[PDB]
Design a protein around this ligand. Structure first.
Ligand SMILES: [Zn+2]
Lengths: 115, 263, 193, 156, 200, 126, 83, 406, 196
């Protein structure tokens, strides 16, 4: 699903870049002509601003999908790294808490000795 | 798997690069040409910068397409993150601080044989290619026969949990297998040079207090002599200088060098 | 047992059989190589299938009997005496004996031997063997033998031998050197011209 | 090339238009500033260094006797060491643009003559200048002068 | 060990020997700085007719039964350990090494052993030290005082600015005799502390 | 007196960095009985480290407040360039230690000879 | 307090600063030692006296331990060798 | 025919030839002649006699061998310096007798650097002494000594106007000691030093006129001529580092936390890429200090959210937050301590929903925390942002904002 | 043939590479100026006596472009001493040397040491030219002096003034290198009436 979505958006991102480049070229040519001798048709034109925001929207959607997948994969690998299941989670949280007590003790002592 | 994690992390940067590169193309165009002191120079500078910006957008888009192919409860995650952080931080700190030690003097052995046996067994557990045979023919001083593939047969002479003498021999050669041939030569010049380099490594790997990491590093450096007669010299490129294979491996850098070609 | 390679080097041009060895051996001496004695390899044949018995001088007491693809027996010299005693019972063949006699040159742990398979009374050809006593492992010590050969042999350097055959951690054997010698000998006997 | 080309074509059309920026500016100002938001929140030095980094044997100074403070620098330096102080001036004319036109020593044979040691030092130092590589430096001339004096001390 | 006392000497004979072989472990440290001054160590192999030396830098030397050869070799090794001591001390006191040559070729042609060479700079810029020890002529140390500090250097009119008056200049020599401490390393750190920033 | 207090201050500042290095190594080896031992070791290290701070501070105060009469000469004016009963006690102690060192050298020579003779015999017996 | 590059550069900076200031305090101590040795050549002599006496005491203790071990092994060997 | 060929292993292709000759008057003595040979089927190139001023050491032989081994590596470096049009003095004996050094006079000025900065650099480079050290004699060190340092640091670097930087180069085992890569890397480091001197000169010129908040907010700490470590924060805890990577030809900033009061990170690691690009487009450090001072306060609040909430880093001062995937919100930081929040998924143009969609219904919650009218922004104080984002118990310790979206 | 002269003159003034490492330890005084000049003059005499008349001048153009291609002024003055003794001994006709020296386009006034040494050598060797050659040399020297600006640097003025002594030597009436009417005819052809 996260890999699948990344695949789905990539063709769209290429399409959005193509339109944004083409629309920019049409707008610049019309603006130069208006200034220049050439008088160009009013036409549909299509606004450059709308395309540039669309490209940014697709970029955010892709980054959000990848960031979630990376966070989910990192959490899974860490979970694997660390008889009944309730006692299992109990001893894990107990180890986690005793490490935190050691942390707090070292911190408070090293901060009370000086500074 | 870890390879998937890296591909996702690389991809996240590639999306950020594509967005930044597209913004750069438009942002630079808005500023437009600059005076540049010359007509030719100003035209060239604008074209060169625009083309570099346009190419960067293409390169960044291509990477994203290629990267697609490759790929009470919160406190627990907080503890996991802090454990990883402390591990990395303390590792880096210990490395940086033991690399540069300000200790200048000491003034301001007896060891259990079973402890040495346990250390040797732990070292033999790793490095599956190497096989170490413990034996005590003469006193508590241990003598280790270390077989490295069909390549080497090293004779380490422990006096304690300490390395004192090493004489490597060939695989086809006879260590006499019995009362151990401590005093002999390999009859081949290459293995004699390897004995010299092993004594040099012993004199190099000398930790003051801890007697285990020294043996660990010695065994790791010996294990590098498994690509002998196979990996050429990293200075001259050939296999043979005066009919010798490269018999030297840099400490801190397990590479290959003829001893005439130094470190 | 140290990895070895044997190849035949053609005399070329109008260089006489002996003239070429004289030159090749001087080229080996020009490697800083020092002579370490003399080597004689004398082989006899039997038309039984086909039997081969060869004995390198490097090995003082062994006599090797090789049965083509079949196993090689490394036996003591009394083996030749048993062979002679059987002789009336045994087949004999007709003057197929082949010998290569040449100087041995040592270059820092590599022994190079260049010799002229003199057939019977008339020399024809040349056999080069480079052996590495330190290299117990074989089939991947090929890079070494190849580099050393390109150093002195240059052209006509062999692209390995099949005695290495299938990639394996199997140690090189005195039997393997003898099989190389047997293929080389079959080629001199039949190269003709 | 791919996917960008018309933009490239467009700007390659419209260079050398004087109004050019206006047009770019107009069509690219609002969207960007809407999306990203508001905008942003005497003597050359090489000779001086060469002098500062000499060996304390030499005591180089300027030359106000002939050309002074003009550009190329004439120098009478010295020889002060355990060696010999024969003819300390060795007038050296370092031309402008120092990393070229290697400086030339203005010869003065009037003082180096009427004395065997001085004739020998002159001969050997001249030969040493002949063997010196092209584009030599001032330190090179000073060192070859010193070593030529030393050769005259030992060879004689 | 009895005659030469300045740097150090040590020997740890092996436990098991043979009838045609033996081995020692020679170390040349300093009197006070044992930790940092651990750059030169030897492992002699006393054969039936030859003594084989394996240095820590990967150098194997076959000596003779002639005592003079071994004595000269050990003297040269002590001379080299003397400069290695200064190097390891500069590494610890944070002094920046400017140059280090194990076998220098500039100077007087020396005895049995080739001379050594080191030059370090003070952490706070201006000051710097240089050391040249050899088997025959050794302990030639000279400090590099900064300019505008000696007040005896002849000034020049070409120097018209005060920025050039900060470079390390007159190269004054120091007498290693009539000094404090009891070891080359003791005297070297006392000299380093003397050329340190006065935090008293 | 003061010259020895200065050496004490030197050894304290040379040892505090080693103590911090040992503390770093202990925090590194602490991966998640043995936890109690690691904790009490870290606490003892911290206490001894604070004691070392106090010692170096007090010796600093001592050497700073001492400032004996003989210090008018600033640094760099002391390095020598080119251009009673205490000595008798020193000589007596030197002669004593020389005699003791000669005796200890004789003892070491005898021990080395003994070890070499035992090793040679036990090697040739085989 | 209450990825890899951050901790990397942080430990670099703090460790290098700690090393520099430690080497500076060592330099200050060495300067004080040099001054006290050059201008008060009597406390250093007392230090040498104390060090030599401590060395002599350590040597005496070592030789005593060696003599005890030697007497033990002498008795052990005298016990054996018998028939 | 009685000669010895002593090859130099460190510097190859150089061979000393020591020939022995019989002396006529003494039938029990020998004479030695030393020649310097060189090789390119070995082909000799040039040959030159060199024979001018216990008995088995032959002192002059070892002396000549050591002299050759020490001097010959400098010849290749001199040739390489001459081949790249770098004016350099010849190999000179240093003042401490024994040595060799190649003191450069002028460097090739630069590429891509303004003329006035080139002048400021060329008038500050006092010496560029190169020296050789290291085992096997293949390490080079160049000591550059600059004068008139623009700005000092908190460390003990406020001494006399002479800053000494040591640049070390160790070529590979092959590619002999005298080669092109050493001087190439040296020129690359010089170019990076110049491109950094640009920014340090700009900052030194802008130091007298400061908006008077960044002066107390930020402080310079070290200046090693290849790195700029500025430190900012209320307690001077956070640190930013400026450096020019010649491999990528772009400025590389590295952020860290050095100070005994801070969070778990520099708190700016979520905007590192946009800050990289920002400094790459316009190399000005005062703008960096300003944007950091403006964006630190909202970042301290937006970093403590539970990680549900996802932080999408958009362009600078435009950090995006998204509860789950359905909801979104835009953070527009501005000067004078104000943040404008938006509806998120809403579009700044024709009223259509984005790919995420799911228009956030309430909207007016942001108004009380002071139809489609969530799309227009709503400014705050950074203190109302602290209240809106720091987890308070409920009027489990959740935020106000996540209670709203929940 | 120009390859032959190339090998000759390049082998004259080669520089030693391996010197300045182990300085002055090589057992050999490099040929001082006199022996080097005699050897150079001998080798060039071999090539010159071998050479044909029609080929007499293109080699001289190569010699002067090789001298003007140099950079060290000691090298230039050594080869100019070689050319001076090659003219003085009678080997070279003393008109081709002067013409190819001045008409060489590398001789510009910015090469001030080359300017000074060149016009010093022409002052040495101009006394043997016949008078028509002295007239053409006068014309080309005046046209060379005419390219200097109105203002030049204050250090280069004395080395620039070396052409003035050649001009003063030609227009000197007691030396009588040429009839003075020819001199004023060339001058008034170059500075007509009304021109300073
Ligand atoms: Zn090699």
């Amino acid at each position: 699903d996260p890999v699948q979505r990344y695949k789905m958006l990539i063709p769209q991102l290429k399409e959005s870049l193509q339109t944004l480049m083409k629309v920019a070229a049409q707008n610049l040519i019309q603006n130069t002509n208006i200034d220049n001798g050439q008088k160009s048709s009013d036409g549909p034109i299509q606004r450059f601003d709308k395309c540039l925001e669309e490209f940014y929207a697709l970029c955010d959607q892709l980054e959000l999908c990848l960031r979630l997948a990376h966070e989910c994969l990192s959490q899974s690998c860490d979970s694997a790294k660390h008889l009944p299941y309730p006692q299992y989670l109990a001893v894990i949280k107990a180890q986690i808490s005793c490490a935190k007590d050691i942390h707090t003790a070292l911190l408070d002592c090293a901060n009370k000795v000086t500074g | 798997v870890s390879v998937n994690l890296e591909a996702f992390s690389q991809a996240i940067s590639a999306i950020q690069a594509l967005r930044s590169s597209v913004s750069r193309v438009f942002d630079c165009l808005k500023d437009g040409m600059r005076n540049k002191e010359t007509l030719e120079g100003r035209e060239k500078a604008f074209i060169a910068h625009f083309q570099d910006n346009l190419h960067s957008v293409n390169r960044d888009l291509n990477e994203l397409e290629r990267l697609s192919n490759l790929v009470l409860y919160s406190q627990l995650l907080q503890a996991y993150k802090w454990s990883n952080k402390l591990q990395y931080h303390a590792g880096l700190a210990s490395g940086l601080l033991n690399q540069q030690s300000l200790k200048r003097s000491a003034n301001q052995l007896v060891l259990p044989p079973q402890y040495v046996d346990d250390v040797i067994s732990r070292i033999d557990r790793m490095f599956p290619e190497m096989s170490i045979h413990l034996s005590r023919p003469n006193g508590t001083s241990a003598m280790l026969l270390v077989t490295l593939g069909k390549v080497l047969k090293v004779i380490v002479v422990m006096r304690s949990l300490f390395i004192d003498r090493t004489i490597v021999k060939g695989y086809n050669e006879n260590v006499y297998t019995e009362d151990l041939d401590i005093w002999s030569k390999s009859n081949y010049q290459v293995f004699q040079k390897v004995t010299d380099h092993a004594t040099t490594a012993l004199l190099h790997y000398q930790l003051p207090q801890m007697p285990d990491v020294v043996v660990r590093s010695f065994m790791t450096w010996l294990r590098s002599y498994i690509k002998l007669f196979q990996a050429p010299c990293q200075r001259c490129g050939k296999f043979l200088q005066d009919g010798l294979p490269p018999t030297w491996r840099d400490f801190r850098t397990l590479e290959a060098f003829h001893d005439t070609c130094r470190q | 047992m140290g990895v070895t390679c044997v190849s035949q080097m053609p005399v070329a041009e109008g260089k006489s059989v002996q003239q070429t060895v004289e030159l090749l051996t001087r080229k080996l001496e020009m490697l800083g190589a020092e002579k370490q004695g003399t080597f004689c390899v004398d082989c006899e044949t039997y038309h039984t299938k086909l039997m081969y018995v060869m004995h390198n001088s490097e090995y003082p007491l062994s006599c090797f009997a090789l049965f083509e693809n079949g196993p090689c027996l490394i036996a003591d010299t009394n083996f030749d005496v048993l062979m002679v005693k059987l002789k009336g019972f045994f087949q004999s063949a007709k003057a197929s004996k082949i010998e290569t006699r040449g100087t041995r040159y040592q270059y820092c742990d590599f022994l190079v031997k260049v010799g002229t398979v003199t057939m019977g009374p008339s020399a024809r050809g040349i056999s080069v063997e480079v052996e590495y006593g330190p290299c117990v492992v074989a089939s991947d010590c090929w890079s070494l033998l190849l580099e050393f050969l390109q150093s002195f042999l240059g052209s006509h350097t062999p692209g390995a031998p099949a005695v290495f055959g299938n990639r394996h951690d199997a140690v090189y054997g005195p039997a393997d050197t003898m099989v190389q010698y047997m293929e080389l000998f079959n080629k001199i006997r039949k190269q003709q011209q | 090339q791919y996917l960008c080309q018309p933009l490239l074509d467009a700007v390659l059309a419209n260079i050398r238009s004087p109004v050019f920026n206006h047009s770019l500016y107009r069509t690219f100002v609002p969207a960007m500033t809407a999306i990203h938001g508001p905008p942003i929140t005497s003597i050359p030095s090489v000779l001086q260094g060469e002098v500062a980094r000499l060996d304390p044997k030499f005591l180089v100074n300027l030359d106000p006797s002939h050309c002074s403070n003009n550009g190329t620098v004439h120098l009478i330096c010295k020889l002060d060491d355990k060696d010999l102080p024969s003819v300390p001036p060795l007038e050296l004319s370092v031309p402008a643009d120092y990393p070229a036109q290697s400086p030339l020593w203005i010869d003065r044979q009037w003082q180096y003559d009427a004395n065997p040691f001085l004739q020998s030092v002159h001969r050997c130092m001249t030969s040493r200048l002949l063997q010196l590589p092209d584009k030599h430096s001032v330190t090179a001339l000073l060192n070859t002068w010193a070593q030529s004096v030393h050769q005259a001390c030992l060879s004689a | 060990a009895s005659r030469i006392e300045d740097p150090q000497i040590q020997a740890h004979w092996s436990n098991i020997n043979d009838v045609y072989e033996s081995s020692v472990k020679v170390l040349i440290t300093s009197q006070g700085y044992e930790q940092i001054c651990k750059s030169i160590q030897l492992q002699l192999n006393i054969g039936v007719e030859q003594i084989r030396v394996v240095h820590r830098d990967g150098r194997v030397i076959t000596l003779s039964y002639q005592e003079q050869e071994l004595q000269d070799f050990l003297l040269s090794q002590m001379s080299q350990h003397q400069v290695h001591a200064v190097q390891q001390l500069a590494k610890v006191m944070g002094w920046q090494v400017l140059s280090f040559s194990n076998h220098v070729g500039l100077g007087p042609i020396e005895s049995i052993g080739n001379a050594s060479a080191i030059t370090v700079a003070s952490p706070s810029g201006d000051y710097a030290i240089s050391v040249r020890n050899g088997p025959e002529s050794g302990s030639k140390i000279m400090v590099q005082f900064p300019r505008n500090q000696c007040k005896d250097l002849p000034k020049s009119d070409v120097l018209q600015d005060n920025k050039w008056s900060h470079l390390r200049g007159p190269f004054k020599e120091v007498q290693w005799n009539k000094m404090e401490g009891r070891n080359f390393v003791y005297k070297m750190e006392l000299l380093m502390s003397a050329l340190s920033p006065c935090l008293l | 007196n003061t010259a020895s207090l200065c050496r004490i201050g030197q050894e304290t500042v040379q040892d505090i960095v080693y103590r911090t290095m040992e503390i770093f190594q202990l925090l590194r080896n602490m991966q998640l009985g043995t936890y109690q031992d690691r904790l009490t070791k870290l606490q003892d290290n911290l206490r001894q480290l604070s004691v070392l701070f106090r010692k170096l501070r007090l010796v600093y105060d001592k050497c700073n407040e001492n400032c004996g009469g003989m210090d008018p000469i600033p640094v760099e004016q002391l390095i020598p360039y080119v251009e009673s009963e205490e000595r008798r006690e020193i000589a007596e102690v030197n002669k004593k230690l020389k005699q003791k060192n000669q005796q200890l050298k004789q003892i070491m020579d005898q021990l080395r000879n003994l070890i070499w003779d035992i090793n040679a015999m036990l090697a040739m017996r085989n | 307090s209450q990825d890899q590059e951050e901790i990397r550069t942080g430990v670099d900076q703090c460790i290098q600063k700690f090393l520099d200031i430690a080497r500076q305090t060592e330099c200050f101590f060495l300067q004080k030692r040099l001054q006290l040795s050059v201008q008060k050549p009597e406390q250093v002599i007392k230090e040498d006296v104390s060090e030599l006496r401590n060395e002599l005491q350590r040597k005496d203790a070592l030789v005593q331990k060696h003599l005890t071990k030697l007497r033990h092994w002498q008795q052990v060997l005298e016990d054996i060798n018998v028939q | 025919k009685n000669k010895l060929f002593i090859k130099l292993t460190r510097l190859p292709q150089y061979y000393i030839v020591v020939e022995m000759l019989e002396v006529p008057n003494k039938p029990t003595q020998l004479s030695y002649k030393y020649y310097f040979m060189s090789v390119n089927p070995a082909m000799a190139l040039l040959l030159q006699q060199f024979k001018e001023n216990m008995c088995a050491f032959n002192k002059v032989l070892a002396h000549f061998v050591a002299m050759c081994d020490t001097n010959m590596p400098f010849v290749g470096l001199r040739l390489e310096l001459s081949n790249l049009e770098i004016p350099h003095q010849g190999v000179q004996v240093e003042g401490d007798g024994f040595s060799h050094a190649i003191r450069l006079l002028k460097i090739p000025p630069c590429k891509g650097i303004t003329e006035e900065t080139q002048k400021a650099l060329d008038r500050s480079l006092l010496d560029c002494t190169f020296r050789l050290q290291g085992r096997n004699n293949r390490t080079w060190v160049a000591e550059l000594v600059f004068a008139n340092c623009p700005l000092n640091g908190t460390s003990t670097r406020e001494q006399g106007p002479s800053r000494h930087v040591y640049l070390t180069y160790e070529n590979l085992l092959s590619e002999p000691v005298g080669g092109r890569k050493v001087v190439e890397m040296f020129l690359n480091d010089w170019n990076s030093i110049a491109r950094l001197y640009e920014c340090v000169l700009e900052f030194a010129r802008s130091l007298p006129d400061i908006p008077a908040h960044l002066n107390i907010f930020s402080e310079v700490r070290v200046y090693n001529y290849r790195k700029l470590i500025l430190c900012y924060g209320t307690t001077k805890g956070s640190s930013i580092s400026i450096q020019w990577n010649s491999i990528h030809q772009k400025f590389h900033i590295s952020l860290g936390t050095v100070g005994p009061n801070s969070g778990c990170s520099n708190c700016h690691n979520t905007i590192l890429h946009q800050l990289q690009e920002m400094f790459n487009k316009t190399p000005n450090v005062v703008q960096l200090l300003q944007v950091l001072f403006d964006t630190q306060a909202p970042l301290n609040a937006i970093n403590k959210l539970p990680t549900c909430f996802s932080i999408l880093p958009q362009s600078s001062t435009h950090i995006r937050l998204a509860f789950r995937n359905m909801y979104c919100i835009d953070i527009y930081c501005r000067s004078r301590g104000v943040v404008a929040i938006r509806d998120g998924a809403y579009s700044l143009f024709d009223n259509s929903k984005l790919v995420e969609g799911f228009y956030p219904a309430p909207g007016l919650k942001t108004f009380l925390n002071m139809s489609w009218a969530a799309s227009i922004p709503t400014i705050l104080t950074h203190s109302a942002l602290n209240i809106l984002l720091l987890p308070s118990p409920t009027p489990y310790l959740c935020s106000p904002l996540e209670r709203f979206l929940g | 043939m120009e390859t032959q002269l190339q090998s000759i003159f390049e082998e004259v003034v080669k520089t030693e590479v391996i010197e300045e490492a182990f300085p002055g330890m090589f057992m050999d005084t490099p040929e001082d100026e006199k022996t080097k000049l005699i050897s150079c003059l001998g080798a060039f005499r071999q090539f010159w006596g071998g050479l044909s008349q029609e080929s007499h001048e293109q080699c001289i153009q190569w010699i002067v472009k090789f001298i003007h291609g140099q950079h060290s002024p000691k090298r230039i003055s050594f080869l100019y001493d070689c050319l001076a003794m090659a003219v003085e001994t009678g080997l070279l006709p003393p008109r081709l040397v002067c013409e190819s020296l001045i008409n060489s386009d590398t001789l510009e006034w910015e090469r001030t040491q080359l300017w000074a040494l060149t016009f010093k050598l022409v002052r040495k060797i101009i006394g043997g030219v016949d008078y028509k050659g002295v007239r053409d040399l006068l014309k080309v020297i005046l046209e060379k002096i005419l390219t200097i600006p109105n203002t030049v640097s204050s250090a280069v003025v004395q080395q620039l003034l070396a052409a003035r002594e050649v001009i003063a030597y030609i227009l000197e009436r007691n030396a009588c290198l040429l009839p003075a009417y020819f001199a004023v005819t060339e001058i008034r052809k170059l500075y007509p009436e009304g021109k300073l």
